[PDB]
Short mmCIF file of N, CA and C in Angstrom, two decimals:
data_model
loop_
_atom_site.label_atom_id
_atom_site.label_comp_id
_atom_site.label_asym_id
_atom_site.label_seq_id
_atom_site.Cartn_x
_atom_site.Cartn_y
_atom_site.Cartn_z
N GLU A 53 38.88 36.74 35.29
CA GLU A 53 38.12 36.42 34.09
C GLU A 53 38.20 34.92 33.77
N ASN A 54 39.42 34.37 33.84
CA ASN A 54 39.58 32.95 33.55
C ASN A 54 38.97 32.05 34.63
N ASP A 55 38.87 32.52 35.88
CA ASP A 55 38.14 31.72 36.86
C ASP A 55 36.66 31.64 36.52
N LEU A 56 36.11 32.68 35.88
CA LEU A 56 34.69 32.62 35.54
C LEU A 56 34.48 31.54 34.48
N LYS A 57 35.36 31.56 33.46
CA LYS A 57 35.25 30.61 32.36
C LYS A 57 35.27 29.18 32.88
N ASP A 58 36.13 28.93 33.87
CA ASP A 58 36.28 27.58 34.41
C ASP A 58 35.05 27.16 35.25
N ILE A 59 34.46 28.10 35.99
CA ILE A 59 33.36 27.67 36.86
C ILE A 59 32.04 27.46 36.12
N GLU A 60 31.81 28.14 34.99
CA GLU A 60 30.57 27.87 34.26
C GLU A 60 30.52 26.42 33.79
N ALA A 61 31.63 25.93 33.25
CA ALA A 61 31.67 24.56 32.79
C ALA A 61 31.47 23.61 33.95
N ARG A 62 32.04 23.95 35.11
CA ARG A 62 31.87 23.09 36.28
C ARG A 62 30.41 23.00 36.73
N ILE A 63 29.73 24.14 36.85
CA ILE A 63 28.30 24.10 37.21
C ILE A 63 27.50 23.27 36.23
N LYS A 64 27.81 23.41 34.94
CA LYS A 64 27.05 22.67 33.95
C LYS A 64 27.28 21.17 34.08
N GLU A 65 28.53 20.78 34.30
CA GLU A 65 28.87 19.37 34.33
C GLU A 65 28.24 18.69 35.54
N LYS A 66 28.22 19.38 36.67
CA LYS A 66 27.69 18.77 37.88
C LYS A 66 26.16 18.72 37.88
N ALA A 67 25.50 19.70 37.25
CA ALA A 67 24.04 19.60 37.12
C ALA A 67 23.65 18.37 36.32
N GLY A 68 24.44 18.04 35.31
CA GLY A 68 24.19 16.90 34.46
C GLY A 68 23.25 17.24 33.32
N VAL A 69 23.38 16.48 32.24
CA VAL A 69 22.47 16.49 31.11
C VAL A 69 21.48 15.34 31.20
N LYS A 70 20.20 15.65 31.00
CA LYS A 70 19.19 14.61 31.05
C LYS A 70 18.20 14.78 29.91
N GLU A 71 17.43 13.72 29.71
CA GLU A 71 16.46 13.59 28.62
C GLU A 71 15.07 13.73 29.21
N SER A 72 14.38 14.81 28.85
CA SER A 72 13.01 15.01 29.28
C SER A 72 12.06 13.93 28.79
N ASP A 73 11.17 13.51 29.70
CA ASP A 73 10.18 12.46 29.46
C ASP A 73 8.83 12.94 29.96
N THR A 74 7.81 12.73 29.14
CA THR A 74 6.47 13.22 29.41
C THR A 74 5.81 12.49 30.58
N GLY A 75 4.86 13.17 31.23
CA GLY A 75 4.10 12.59 32.34
C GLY A 75 2.59 12.83 32.30
N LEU A 76 1.89 12.44 33.37
CA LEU A 76 0.46 12.72 33.53
C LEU A 76 0.08 12.53 35.00
N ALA A 77 -0.28 13.63 35.66
CA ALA A 77 -0.67 13.65 37.07
C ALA A 77 -2.00 12.96 37.34
N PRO A 78 -3.02 13.09 36.48
CA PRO A 78 -4.22 12.26 36.63
C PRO A 78 -4.01 10.77 36.42
N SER A 79 -2.78 10.31 36.18
CA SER A 79 -2.47 8.89 36.22
C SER A 79 -1.50 8.70 37.37
N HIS A 80 -2.01 8.18 38.46
CA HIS A 80 -1.22 7.75 39.59
C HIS A 80 -1.29 6.25 39.70
N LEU A 81 -2.14 5.66 38.88
CA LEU A 81 -2.29 4.23 38.72
C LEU A 81 -2.38 4.06 37.22
N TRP A 82 -1.46 3.29 36.68
CA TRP A 82 -1.41 3.03 35.26
C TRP A 82 -1.23 1.55 35.02
N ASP A 83 -1.05 0.78 36.09
CA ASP A 83 -0.93 -0.66 36.07
C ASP A 83 -2.21 -1.24 36.64
N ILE A 84 -3.29 -0.60 36.22
CA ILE A 84 -4.60 -1.21 36.21
C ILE A 84 -4.97 -1.62 34.79
N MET A 85 -4.37 -0.98 33.79
CA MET A 85 -4.51 -1.33 32.39
C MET A 85 -3.15 -1.48 31.74
N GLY A 86 -2.07 -1.27 32.49
CA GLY A 86 -0.75 -1.50 31.95
C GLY A 86 -0.39 -2.95 32.03
N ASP A 87 -0.91 -3.64 33.04
CA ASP A 87 -0.55 -5.01 33.27
C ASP A 87 -1.20 -5.94 32.26
N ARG A 88 -2.33 -5.50 31.69
CA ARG A 88 -3.06 -6.24 30.68
C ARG A 88 -2.34 -6.20 29.35
N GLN A 89 -1.70 -5.09 29.07
CA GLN A 89 -0.94 -4.93 27.85
C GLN A 89 0.40 -5.61 27.96
N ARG A 90 0.78 -6.03 29.16
CA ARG A 90 2.10 -6.52 29.46
C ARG A 90 2.10 -8.04 29.65
N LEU A 91 3.22 -8.64 29.25
CA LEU A 91 3.77 -9.93 29.70
C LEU A 91 3.24 -11.22 29.07
N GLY A 92 2.08 -11.20 28.41
CA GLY A 92 1.65 -12.28 27.57
C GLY A 92 1.55 -11.84 26.12
N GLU A 93 0.81 -12.62 25.33
CA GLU A 93 0.73 -12.29 23.91
C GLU A 93 -0.75 -11.98 23.70
N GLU A 94 -1.07 -10.75 23.37
CA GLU A 94 -2.44 -10.43 23.01
C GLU A 94 -2.51 -9.45 21.86
N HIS A 95 -1.46 -8.71 21.57
CA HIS A 95 -0.29 -9.11 20.78
C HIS A 95 0.11 -7.80 20.11
N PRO A 96 1.36 -7.50 19.93
CA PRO A 96 1.69 -6.43 18.99
C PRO A 96 2.18 -6.96 17.67
N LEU A 97 1.64 -6.38 16.61
CA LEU A 97 1.38 -7.09 15.38
C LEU A 97 2.39 -6.68 14.34
N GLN A 98 2.93 -7.67 13.65
CA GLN A 98 3.80 -7.37 12.53
C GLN A 98 2.89 -6.88 11.42
N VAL A 99 3.06 -5.63 11.05
CA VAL A 99 2.13 -5.00 10.13
C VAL A 99 2.40 -5.50 8.73
N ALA A 100 1.33 -5.81 8.01
CA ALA A 100 1.41 -6.33 6.67
C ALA A 100 0.40 -5.61 5.80
N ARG A 101 0.29 -6.05 4.55
CA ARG A 101 -0.60 -5.40 3.62
C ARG A 101 -1.01 -6.39 2.55
N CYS A 102 -2.30 -6.40 2.25
CA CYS A 102 -2.84 -7.29 1.24
C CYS A 102 -2.38 -6.86 -0.14
N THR A 103 -1.87 -7.82 -0.90
CA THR A 103 -1.44 -7.61 -2.27
C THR A 103 -2.33 -8.30 -3.29
N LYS A 104 -3.14 -9.28 -2.86
CA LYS A 104 -4.06 -9.97 -3.75
C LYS A 104 -5.03 -10.81 -2.92
N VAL B 146 4.40 -20.55 -6.08
CA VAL B 146 3.95 -21.69 -5.28
C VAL B 146 3.82 -21.36 -3.80
N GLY B 147 3.03 -22.20 -3.14
CA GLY B 147 3.05 -22.26 -1.70
C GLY B 147 4.19 -23.13 -1.20
N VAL B 148 4.77 -22.73 -0.08
CA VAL B 148 5.80 -23.50 0.60
C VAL B 148 5.50 -23.48 2.08
N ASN B 149 5.59 -24.64 2.71
CA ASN B 149 5.29 -24.75 4.13
C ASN B 149 6.44 -24.15 4.91
N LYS B 150 6.12 -23.19 5.78
CA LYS B 150 7.17 -22.36 6.37
C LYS B 150 8.03 -23.18 7.31
N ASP B 151 7.38 -24.02 8.10
CA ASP B 151 8.02 -24.74 9.19
C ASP B 151 9.15 -25.61 8.64
N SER B 152 8.84 -26.36 7.58
CA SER B 152 9.79 -27.21 6.89
C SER B 152 9.49 -27.03 5.42
N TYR B 153 10.50 -26.65 4.67
CA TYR B 153 10.27 -26.07 3.35
C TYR B 153 9.96 -27.17 2.36
N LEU B 154 8.67 -27.33 2.06
CA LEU B 154 8.20 -28.28 1.06
C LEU B 154 7.09 -27.60 0.27
N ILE B 155 7.07 -27.74 -1.07
CA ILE B 155 5.91 -27.22 -1.80
C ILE B 155 4.63 -27.82 -1.29
N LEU B 156 3.78 -26.95 -0.78
CA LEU B 156 2.47 -27.32 -0.30
C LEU B 156 1.50 -27.45 -1.45
N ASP B 157 1.40 -26.38 -2.24
CA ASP B 157 0.41 -26.25 -3.28
C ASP B 157 0.99 -25.30 -4.32
N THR B 158 0.22 -25.10 -5.37
CA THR B 158 0.33 -23.99 -6.30
C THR B 158 -0.74 -22.94 -6.07
N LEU B 159 -0.38 -21.72 -6.45
CA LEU B 159 -1.18 -20.53 -6.25
C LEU B 159 -1.05 -19.69 -7.51
N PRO B 160 -2.03 -18.85 -7.81
CA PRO B 160 -1.88 -17.94 -8.94
C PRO B 160 -0.78 -16.92 -8.68
N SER B 161 -0.33 -16.32 -9.77
CA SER B 161 0.82 -15.42 -9.76
C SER B 161 0.51 -14.11 -9.04
N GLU B 162 1.54 -13.57 -8.39
CA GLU B 162 1.44 -12.33 -7.62
C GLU B 162 1.28 -11.13 -8.54
N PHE B 163 0.60 -10.10 -8.03
CA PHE B 163 0.53 -8.79 -8.66
C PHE B 163 0.67 -7.74 -7.59
N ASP B 164 1.24 -6.62 -7.99
CA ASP B 164 1.48 -5.54 -7.06
C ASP B 164 0.18 -4.79 -6.81
N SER B 165 0.08 -4.23 -5.60
CA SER B 165 -1.19 -3.73 -5.08
C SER B 165 -1.78 -2.63 -5.96
N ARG B 166 -0.93 -1.77 -6.50
CA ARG B 166 -1.44 -0.70 -7.34
C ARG B 166 -2.02 -1.25 -8.63
N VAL B 167 -1.64 -2.47 -9.01
CA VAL B 167 -2.08 -3.06 -10.26
C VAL B 167 -3.36 -3.83 -10.10
N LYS B 168 -3.76 -4.07 -8.88
CA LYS B 168 -4.95 -4.84 -8.61
C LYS B 168 -6.18 -3.96 -8.58
N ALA B 169 -5.97 -2.65 -8.49
CA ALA B 169 -7.03 -1.67 -8.44
C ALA B 169 -7.24 -1.03 -9.80
N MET B 170 -6.46 -1.45 -10.79
CA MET B 170 -6.74 -1.03 -12.15
C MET B 170 -8.08 -1.59 -12.61
N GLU B 171 -8.51 -2.71 -12.03
CA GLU B 171 -9.66 -3.41 -12.56
C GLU B 171 -10.94 -2.59 -12.40
N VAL B 172 -11.96 -3.01 -13.14
CA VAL B 172 -13.31 -2.53 -12.87
C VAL B 172 -13.79 -3.07 -11.53
N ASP B 173 -14.78 -2.39 -10.99
CA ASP B 173 -15.43 -2.81 -9.76
C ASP B 173 -16.94 -2.54 -9.83
N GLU B 174 -17.55 -2.67 -11.04
CA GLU B 174 -18.83 -2.02 -11.42
C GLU B 174 -18.69 -0.56 -11.79
N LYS B 175 -17.75 -0.32 -12.69
CA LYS B 175 -17.58 0.98 -13.31
C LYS B 175 -18.87 1.49 -13.95
N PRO B 176 -19.30 2.72 -13.63
CA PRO B 176 -20.41 3.34 -14.36
C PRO B 176 -20.11 3.59 -15.83
N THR B 177 -21.15 3.50 -16.63
CA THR B 177 -21.10 3.86 -18.04
C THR B 177 -21.52 5.31 -18.18
N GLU B 178 -21.09 5.94 -19.28
CA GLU B 178 -21.44 7.32 -19.58
C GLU B 178 -22.15 7.47 -20.91
N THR B 179 -22.63 6.38 -21.49
CA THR B 179 -22.71 6.14 -22.93
C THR B 179 -23.01 7.35 -23.80
N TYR B 180 -23.17 7.11 -25.09
CA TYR B 180 -23.15 8.11 -26.13
C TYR B 180 -24.21 9.17 -25.96
N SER B 181 -24.88 9.13 -24.82
CA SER B 181 -25.90 10.08 -24.44
C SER B 181 -25.33 11.27 -23.71
N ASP B 182 -24.06 11.20 -23.33
CA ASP B 182 -23.29 12.30 -22.80
C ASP B 182 -22.43 12.93 -23.88
N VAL B 183 -22.59 12.50 -25.13
CA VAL B 183 -21.79 13.01 -26.23
C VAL B 183 -22.72 13.46 -27.34
N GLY B 184 -22.70 14.75 -27.61
CA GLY B 184 -23.38 15.31 -28.76
C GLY B 184 -22.38 16.10 -29.57
N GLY B 185 -22.44 15.93 -30.88
CA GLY B 185 -21.39 16.44 -31.73
C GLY B 185 -20.18 15.52 -31.73
N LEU B 186 -19.48 15.51 -32.87
CA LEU B 186 -18.26 14.74 -33.12
C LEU B 186 -18.51 13.23 -33.16
N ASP B 187 -19.41 12.84 -34.04
CA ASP B 187 -19.68 11.42 -34.23
C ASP B 187 -18.51 10.70 -34.89
N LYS B 188 -17.81 11.38 -35.80
CA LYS B 188 -16.77 10.70 -36.56
C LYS B 188 -15.74 10.07 -35.63
N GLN B 189 -15.41 10.79 -34.57
CA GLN B 189 -14.41 10.29 -33.65
C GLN B 189 -14.85 8.95 -33.09
N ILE B 190 -16.12 8.87 -32.73
CA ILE B 190 -16.61 7.68 -32.08
C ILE B 190 -16.44 6.50 -33.01
N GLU B 191 -16.72 6.73 -34.29
CA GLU B 191 -16.74 5.62 -35.22
C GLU B 191 -15.36 5.01 -35.36
N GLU B 192 -14.36 5.88 -35.38
CA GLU B 192 -13.01 5.39 -35.52
C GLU B 192 -12.62 4.55 -34.31
N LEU B 193 -13.08 4.98 -33.14
CA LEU B 193 -12.73 4.26 -31.92
C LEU B 193 -13.32 2.86 -31.92
N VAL B 194 -14.58 2.75 -32.33
CA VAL B 194 -15.22 1.44 -32.30
C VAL B 194 -14.49 0.49 -33.23
N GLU B 195 -14.19 0.97 -34.45
CA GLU B 195 -13.56 0.09 -35.44
C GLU B 195 -12.19 -0.36 -34.97
N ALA B 196 -11.43 0.54 -34.34
CA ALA B 196 -10.06 0.22 -33.98
C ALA B 196 -9.99 -0.82 -32.88
N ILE B 197 -10.78 -0.64 -31.82
CA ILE B 197 -10.56 -1.37 -30.58
C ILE B 197 -11.58 -2.48 -30.41
N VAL B 198 -12.86 -2.13 -30.50
CA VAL B 198 -13.87 -3.03 -29.97
C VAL B 198 -14.08 -4.20 -30.91
N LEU B 199 -14.15 -3.93 -32.19
CA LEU B 199 -14.52 -4.96 -33.14
C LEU B 199 -13.42 -5.97 -33.45
N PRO B 200 -12.13 -5.61 -33.43
CA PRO B 200 -11.10 -6.67 -33.53
C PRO B 200 -11.07 -7.60 -32.33
N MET B 201 -11.63 -7.20 -31.19
CA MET B 201 -11.77 -8.13 -30.09
C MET B 201 -12.82 -9.16 -30.40
N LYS B 202 -14.01 -8.68 -30.72
CA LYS B 202 -15.17 -9.53 -30.83
C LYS B 202 -15.17 -10.24 -32.17
N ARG B 203 -14.89 -9.48 -33.22
CA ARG B 203 -14.76 -10.00 -34.57
C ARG B 203 -13.30 -10.32 -34.89
N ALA B 204 -12.73 -11.14 -34.02
CA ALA B 204 -11.34 -11.53 -34.11
C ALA B 204 -11.10 -12.66 -35.11
N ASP B 205 -12.16 -13.36 -35.55
CA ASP B 205 -12.00 -14.40 -36.56
C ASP B 205 -11.89 -13.80 -37.95
N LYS B 206 -12.73 -12.80 -38.22
CA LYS B 206 -12.71 -12.13 -39.51
C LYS B 206 -11.36 -11.56 -39.78
N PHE B 207 -10.68 -11.22 -38.72
CA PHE B 207 -9.41 -10.57 -38.81
C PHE B 207 -8.35 -11.52 -39.33
N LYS B 208 -8.49 -12.79 -39.00
CA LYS B 208 -7.56 -13.82 -39.45
C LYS B 208 -7.83 -14.17 -40.89
N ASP B 209 -9.11 -14.15 -41.22
CA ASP B 209 -9.57 -14.29 -42.59
C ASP B 209 -8.95 -13.23 -43.47
N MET B 210 -8.99 -12.00 -42.99
CA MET B 210 -8.43 -10.88 -43.73
C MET B 210 -6.94 -11.08 -43.97
N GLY B 211 -6.24 -11.62 -42.97
CA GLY B 211 -4.86 -11.99 -43.11
C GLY B 211 -3.92 -10.96 -42.53
N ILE B 212 -4.38 -10.19 -41.55
CA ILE B 212 -3.64 -9.07 -40.99
C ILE B 212 -3.45 -9.30 -39.48
N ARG B 213 -2.50 -8.55 -38.90
CA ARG B 213 -2.17 -8.62 -37.47
C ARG B 213 -2.90 -7.59 -36.63
N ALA B 214 -3.11 -7.94 -35.36
CA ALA B 214 -3.97 -7.21 -34.45
C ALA B 214 -3.44 -5.80 -34.21
N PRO B 215 -4.30 -4.87 -33.79
CA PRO B 215 -3.78 -3.58 -33.34
C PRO B 215 -3.36 -3.59 -31.88
N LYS B 216 -2.25 -2.90 -31.62
CA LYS B 216 -1.76 -2.80 -30.27
C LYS B 216 -2.34 -1.60 -29.53
N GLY B 217 -3.00 -0.70 -30.23
CA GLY B 217 -3.63 0.42 -29.58
C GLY B 217 -3.99 1.49 -30.57
#
Protein backbone atom coordinates (compact mmCIF):
# COMPACT_ATOMS: atom_id res chain seq x y z
CA GLU A 1 0.00 0.00 0.00
CA ASN A 2 2.77 2.45 0.92
CA ASP A 3 4.66 1.68 -2.29
CA LEU A 4 1.58 2.84 -4.22
CA LYS A 5 1.47 6.12 -2.31
CA ASP A 6 5.13 6.76 -3.11
CA ILE A 7 4.93 5.99 -6.84
CA GLU A 8 1.96 8.26 -7.62
CA ALA A 9 3.92 11.28 -6.44
CA ARG A 10 6.91 10.11 -8.47
CA ILE A 11 4.93 9.81 -11.73
CA LYS A 12 3.47 13.24 -11.15
CA GLU A 13 6.80 14.88 -10.42
CA LYS A 14 8.53 13.45 -13.47
CA ALA A 15 5.72 14.35 -15.87
CA GLY A 16 6.13 17.93 -14.70
CA VAL A 17 3.70 20.81 -14.29
CA LYS A 18 3.26 23.15 -17.23
CA GLU A 19 1.23 26.18 -18.25
CA SER A 20 -1.11 25.72 -21.20
CA ASP A 21 -0.75 28.27 -24.01
CA THR A 22 -3.18 28.81 -26.88
CA GLY A 23 -2.36 28.11 -30.54
CA LEU A 24 -3.64 28.30 -34.15
CA ALA A 25 -2.91 25.74 -36.89
CA PRO A 26 -4.02 28.04 -39.76
CA SER A 27 -1.11 30.25 -38.65
CA HIS A 28 2.12 28.62 -39.71
CA LEU A 29 3.44 32.02 -40.66
CA TRP A 30 2.81 34.81 -38.21
CA ASP A 31 5.96 36.85 -38.86
CA ILE A 32 4.53 38.21 -42.02
CA MET A 33 2.57 40.65 -39.82
CA GLY A 34 4.35 39.98 -36.55
CA ASP A 35 7.52 41.66 -37.70
CA ARG A 36 5.65 44.88 -38.48
CA GLN A 37 4.31 45.09 -34.97
CA ARG A 38 7.80 44.38 -33.65
CA LEU A 39 11.04 46.24 -32.99
CA GLY A 40 10.37 49.88 -33.90
CA GLU A 41 7.91 52.43 -32.60
CA GLU A 42 4.58 52.54 -34.37
CA HIS A 43 3.57 52.36 -31.17
CA PRO A 44 1.81 50.96 -28.12
CA LEU A 45 0.12 53.79 -26.46
CA GLN A 46 -0.01 55.08 -22.94
CA VAL A 47 -3.75 55.33 -22.57
CA ALA A 48 -5.12 58.66 -21.43
CA ARG A 49 -8.42 60.46 -21.21
CA CYS A 50 -9.60 63.96 -22.02
CA THR A 51 -10.59 65.98 -18.97
CA LYS A 52 -11.16 69.37 -20.65
CA VAL B 1 -0.11 76.57 -15.18
CA GLY B 2 1.77 75.01 -18.01
CA VAL B 3 5.25 73.69 -17.25
CA ASN B 4 7.74 72.55 -19.85
CA LYS B 5 8.33 68.88 -19.18
CA ASP B 6 11.89 68.61 -20.46
CA SER B 7 13.18 71.34 -18.13
CA TYR B 8 10.73 72.58 -15.58
CA LEU B 9 9.91 76.20 -16.34
CA ILE B 10 6.48 77.87 -16.43
CA LEU B 11 5.61 77.98 -20.08
CA ASP B 12 2.22 79.65 -19.91
CA THR B 13 -0.96 79.91 -17.92
CA LEU B 14 -4.02 77.80 -18.62
CA PRO B 15 -7.57 77.79 -17.26
CA SER B 16 -8.32 75.71 -14.20
CA GLU B 17 -8.90 71.94 -14.40
CA PHE B 18 -12.28 70.27 -13.98
CA ASP B 19 -13.09 66.64 -13.58
CA SER B 20 -14.58 64.84 -16.56
CA ARG B 21 -17.96 64.12 -15.01
CA VAL B 22 -18.30 67.85 -14.27
CA LYS B 23 -17.68 68.92 -17.82
CA ALA B 24 -20.76 67.10 -19.09
CA MET B 25 -23.05 68.87 -16.68
CA GLU B 26 -23.18 71.69 -19.21
CA VAL B 27 -25.78 72.28 -21.86
CA ASP B 28 -24.98 71.15 -25.37
CA GLU B 29 -28.14 72.57 -27.08
CA LYS B 30 -30.53 71.21 -24.52
CA PRO B 31 -34.12 70.96 -25.85
CA THR B 32 -36.82 73.07 -24.27
CA GLU B 33 -40.14 71.61 -23.12
CA THR B 34 -41.83 74.92 -22.47
CA TYR B 35 -45.11 75.61 -20.72
CA SER B 36 -46.90 73.91 -23.58
CA ASP B 37 -46.16 70.52 -22.02
CA VAL B 38 -47.74 71.72 -18.77
CA GLY B 39 -51.46 72.08 -18.27
CA GLY B 40 -52.83 72.55 -14.81
CA LEU B 41 -50.85 73.76 -11.76
CA ASP B 42 -49.97 77.27 -12.83
CA LYS B 43 -49.28 78.43 -9.28
CA GLN B 44 -46.22 76.23 -9.06
CA ILE B 45 -44.75 77.78 -12.15
CA GLU B 46 -45.16 81.28 -10.83
CA GLU B 47 -43.26 80.57 -7.66
CA LEU B 48 -40.41 79.06 -9.63
CA VAL B 49 -40.00 82.06 -11.90
CA GLU B 50 -39.97 84.53 -9.02
CA ALA B 51 -37.48 82.53 -6.96
CA ILE B 52 -34.83 81.71 -9.53
CA VAL B 53 -35.06 83.48 -12.83
CA LEU B 54 -35.84 87.05 -11.90
CA PRO B 55 -33.17 87.56 -9.18
CA MET B 56 -30.66 86.66 -11.89
CA LYS B 57 -31.86 89.11 -14.47
CA ARG B 58 -33.38 91.67 -12.11
CA ALA B 59 -30.38 91.53 -9.84
CA ASP B 60 -30.13 95.34 -9.47
CA LYS B 61 -33.62 95.73 -8.03
CA PHE B 62 -32.60 93.21 -5.48
CA LYS B 63 -29.84 95.45 -4.15
CA ASP B 64 -32.26 98.33 -4.11
CA MET B 65 -34.58 96.23 -1.99
CA GLY B 66 -31.68 95.64 0.39
CA ILE B 67 -31.85 91.84 0.67
CA ARG B 68 -29.49 88.90 -0.04
CA ALA B 69 -29.69 86.50 -2.96
CA PRO B 70 -31.41 83.11 -2.83
CA LYS B 71 -29.23 80.05 -2.79
CA GLY B 72 -31.95 77.81 -4.17
